[PDB]
Ligand SMILES: Cn1nc(-c2ccc(O)cc2O)c2cccc(C(F)(F)F)c21
């Protein structure tokens with residue numbers, strides 16, 4: 001393969017290069033909105049963000065080496081997680097605010113689902129206090145992609161490959177922290193701190209996926225065909 | 237301020253090992269549970285009696301007692317199913333393809349598909365157990381991971397907890413270094429172990445959804461404690 | 471209130 | 481069959 005032969009700095013350069021763009025929402029301050037319309041803003045934004053995430057996933061080292069069936073599965077499991085960590089990353093420099101899009105800033109008081117917002121706000125607040133680096137962010141985001149659905153025959157050969165690639169990203173994270181002058185103790189701690197966030201991001205995803213289900217059944221918030229197929233695989 | 241920080245790594249290990257809750261038994265009924273009423277009745281009953289021990293265990297976790305009562309309640313409400321599950325997959329390690337809920341209650345996936353939704357929860361629990369067995373997970377590592385879950389899972393919803401979490405991280409690294417692992421093997425294994433916690437969270441949320449559905453269907457009665465744990469979730 | 475409030479007390 | 485499948489296959 002090629003993912004295993006990459007150096008830590010090559011790994012970082014590859015991930016930074018593959019970074020998806022920041023899209024705008026359809027939000028209009030002169031247009032009235034409703035609980036359902038504001039929800040439509042998020043789902044619509046997420047829908048065309050998925051098309052960029054797919055091309056982003058292809059450029060993640062080791063991902064394209066996997067079978068098309070496994071690639072589909074990994075994205076069906078982590079797409080909301082990846083979206084959320086992307087949200088809290090760009091929401092860091094906005095205390096008490098969530099930056100869904102450059103033209104869409106929402107705080108806790110616009111809780112159309114306060115609980116999910118507060119969790120996202122807390123996660124973003126955690127990143128701000130840790131002074132999360134962009135290099136660390138793209139590592140964490142790629143970890144989520146490869147890890148979120150790795151636990152669902154010669155298929156085991158692929159599982160070990162993901163484990164191998166995951167170990168590479170671990171060394172890459174440690175490489176960054178060592179480069180940042182952190183002591184060996186601080187490197188272990190920061191690594192642990194960063195990965196414990198992923199447990200919470202997974203939690204926020206599961207909570208969000210349940211709300212996404214209710215929006216489908218209530219049939220008032222527009223859900224694209226792709227989002228429906230994403231949700232359907234999660235409720236399989 | 238908190239005693240947990242003055243603890244050495246070996247003292248931290250000894251504290252967690254000594255605070256370990258017992259392995260409880262299910263009813264000595266030799267009947268193989270296939271009905272959803274019979275199986276889930278045994279799981280909820282087992283969870284009920286285990287929750288009392290978990291509470292007692294939680295108190296003896298360094299740093300947990302230093303928190304306010306409300307914070308202690310919150311952490312247990314968030315992580316109790318995670319803690320039960322990581323305990324399940326731990327003692328199920330030596331029984332591949334099987335889940336050791338109790339020494340007299342082993343469940344395979346063939347029993348799980350006699351209950352709608354459970355067979356995927358079982359498969360996820362089986363995969364976690366096999367993953368633990370392949371990493372050669374040690375008991376000293378297990379008690380650290382379980383305490384991490386207790387302290388981490390509810391953190392957001394405060395510097396002290398983060399400091400204790402760092403101590404456990406130092407404790408985990410300490411154990412691996414005692415086992416002769418190189419520095420690279422130390423941060424790789426640490427990363428691997430902590431990535432399992434995301435899946436444990438996933439299984440817990442899925443398990444909480446099934447628990448809620450049982451309360452709605454009303455056929456398996458739930459104890460007041462399990463109901464209050466479930467309400468806290470939703 | 472909660473049973474957890476009581477069981478955590480001793 | 482899936483949209484995600486078609487887009488990954490591109
Ligand atoms: C809570 N949440 N957050 C998003 C979202 C959209 C775009 C983005 O870049 C990040 C996000 O978290 C999102 C998209 C679709 C549905 C939901 C919800 F269902 F609420 F969980 C969502």
Ligand SMILES: Cn1nc(-c2ccc(O)cc2O)c2cccc(C(F)(F)F)c21
Nearest residue numbers: 279280282283320321324443444446447
């Ligand atoms: C899925 N699951 N698993 C358990 C359980 C009970 C005891 C234990 O030691 C470990 C467990 O995972 C359990 C207890 C109560 C309810 C559920 C279920 F609802 F299925 F999620 C449970």
